[PDB]
Subunit: 298 residues, 2 copies
């Protein structure tokens, strides 16, 4: 009873070696892959992907393990939910469609996959936009009292299983709603289309989906940080022209000035704040869409 | 619920903020023992009888914990700040005629204890803190490693009712998880099952969990600000003090505890105990030994 929020978009179940990636696919022109983050699914793009689809073949995919994508079984190192792995799996998915070179915009966890993709396999990306993130390394390196309080869930969801899972399972609805709400500008759910919230809530209702989210966060604390650490200590920069968009009241701007940070990671980065909380494409769809269209159309 | 303090009486000590529950036994100089999170006074059940051979031992539930009353909190978590708990415990000791006493605290109770020593050092003959560094030091050393290790310092201090609602998701699991994961063994085998039942029952009460959260909210806000002012004015604890910490405890995950405490205390003695976080229960003999030696 989940709404179809991408009227006119097709649906694809893309097989990869790590499981099927679900995607809505619409538009035509150059391929643009949109990746959501937590605690969301591909439908968070539903307000901007139509605009995007006027100019691009828009592929709106659920991350590995999220939404209707399959859930690779994780391991002690949370390997399939490391951004490196997810990027490789999304690269595979895109190859299934014939897209070996594509534009990529990610938000939140999807943005982490995206900049990791761009570090690991920059030849896959024409351009990269990341929405309301700094690299995982930067969040962890900026993890002082103020920021540990702000993004407590980085520590909490990365606790060994089954601790987050057990607590999240008592009232999953509360938690997904709380995160959605608290990272918006308003502090409530009013930015979101209720039909979109239903998608998030239903995804969150599945204990396996929750586990995957924790795995994602577990990777975010461990391997993802390690991978980032290697690159930043090696001076490895993303060579792909990139856009860093962040919400003026989003999470990234709370750790540090986002463009300063990103210029350390990317040799060709432009940046813009958007008056918005974390959920740029739902809180600020027009502004987001326009920034992405302008960037990817250059 | 077992009586783990045979021969101790049980007193309800009135204060202006509510009743403090305490087991009291022994005779001789008063020694107040304060537990921490997520426990209650019975955490002292293995060490208290040895202390009671030489001291009047008051084994108190912190304000809001165990069987002590829960003062209503406020937007600043005032009653659950260590300053406010210290004040309430001083008042409770005064009700017993104890205006000058020895104090040992573990975890949250040790935070009350050193804040007590900073605020009202005339109240204390000697002080022992078990497996803590000052709250300021945990937050100042906040980084990736410590954020993951003491994630609950950020989690429990999130605004209500988020931790409350989460904790309510599986309270029996959480408290056993807290207890197990901070031990050397990594399971509950160091605890007396009857003590665990005490811990489980207190944590089963949502209002009790709320207070624990209020304590941690205090830990993140007011307690840190109070500590900062002492750091920034150079105030040191002038009370002879013993810092004990588990070789695999929380305190040493942040820094070398004795060198930390030397910054906070003029007269600090220190020793690592072969244990995780729950010194009196994992390492009852070594812990009691050190406390007796120190306080006598």
């Amino acid at each position: 009873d989940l709404a179809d929020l991408f009227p006119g978009f097709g649906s694809e179940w893309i097989n990869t070696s790590s499981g099927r990636i679900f995607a809505r696919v619409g538009g035509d022109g150059p391929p643009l892959l949109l990746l959501h983050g937590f605690p969301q699914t591909h439908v968070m793009w539903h307000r901007v992907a139509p605009k995007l689809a006027e100019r691009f073949k828009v592929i709106v995919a659920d991350l590995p393990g999220y939404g209707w994508s399959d859930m690779p079984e994780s391991d002690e190192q949370h390997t399939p939910y490391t951004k490196r792995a997810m990027a490789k799996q999304l690269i595979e998915a895109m190859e299934q469609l014939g897209h070996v070179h594509f534009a990529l915009a990610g938000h939140d966890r999807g943005a982490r996959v995206s900049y990791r993709l761009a570090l690991d396999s920059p030849g896959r990306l024409s351009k990269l936009a990341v929405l309301d993130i700094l690299p995982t390394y930067e969040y962890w390196q900026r993890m002082n009292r103020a920021y540990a309080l702000k993004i407590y869930h980085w520590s909490f969801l990365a606790q060994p299983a089954p601790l987050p899972e057990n607590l999240l399972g008592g009232d999953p609805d509360f938690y997904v709603k709380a995160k959605l709400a608290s990272w918006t500008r308003a502090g409530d759910l009013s930015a979101f289309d209720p039909r979109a919230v239903e998608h998030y809530r239903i995804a969150f209702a599945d204990p396996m989906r929750r586990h995957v989210m924790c795995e994602d966060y577990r990777a975010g604390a461990y391997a993802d940080f390690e991978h980032d650490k290697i690159d930043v200590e090696a001076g490895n920069k993303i060579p792909v022209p990139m856009l860093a968009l962040w919400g003026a009241s989003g999470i990234a701007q709370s750790a540090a000035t986002p463009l300063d940070v990103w210029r350390k990671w990317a040799s060709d980065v432009q940046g813009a704040p958007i008056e918005s909380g974390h959920f740029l494409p739902e809180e600020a769809p027009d502004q987001t869409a326009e920034a992405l269209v302008r960037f990817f159309s250059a």
